[PDB]
Design a protein around this ligand. Sequence first.
Ligand SMILES: CO[C@@H]1CC/C=C/c2cccc(c2)COC(=O)[C@@H]2CCCN(N2)C(=O)[C@H](Cc2cccc(O)c2)NC(=O)[C@H](C(C)C)NC(=O)[C@@H]1C
Length: 163
Amino acid sequence: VNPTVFFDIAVDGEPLGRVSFELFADKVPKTAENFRALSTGEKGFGYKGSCFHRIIPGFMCQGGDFTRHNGTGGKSIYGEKFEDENFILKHTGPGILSMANAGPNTNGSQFFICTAKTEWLDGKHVVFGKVKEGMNIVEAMERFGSRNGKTSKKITIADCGQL
Ligand SMILES: CO[C@@H]1CC/C=C/c2cccc(c2)COC(=O)[C@@H]2CCCN(N2)C(=O)[C@H](Cc2cccc(O)c2)NC(=O)[C@H](C(C)C)NC(=O)[C@@H]1C
């Protein structure tokens, strides 16, 4: 019953590969549904065409700002921001999909994909999914990141949707 969604990733407009995610709707249904609907674009806005604006090798890849395209924006399907649903799941290792935020109860659309166990984020960021297929594509994305997170090529979600 857990949905699966995909991102087709491009590097300076050339196809890199597809990352697929399981969304844990069984444990964080509101948060999973936000990400699912933003991936299909069914509300008329969402992840398609947006970029990964911060990639820090050995840490995580962050994206999801489709409103300002400068790291500060994005919005949820629930208006603007929404509350932290729960912190049942933890940042246990590579592939974990979690909500970016600016403190408590500020979930919008920005998210990050962990490439390592990041337990200092537990209880601060809502974990809601995991990479299902295409972790090798996330590893390739890291090669375009840097210590401070600026990317050396434009890393975009060329297409996305639900499987
Ligand atoms: C541009 O926005 C501002 C952020 C300023 C810069 C943060 C920064 C720069 C370089 C490396 C790192 C963080 C390392 O940590 C991450 O990479 C973490 C990893 C988990 C996901 N994540 N970033 C986030 O969720 C970060 C967590 C954060 C905020 C503030 C400072 C900080 O050190 C880390 N939050 C944000 O990016 C939110 C955004 C979702 C609307 N923006 C904001 O709070 C501000 C308005």
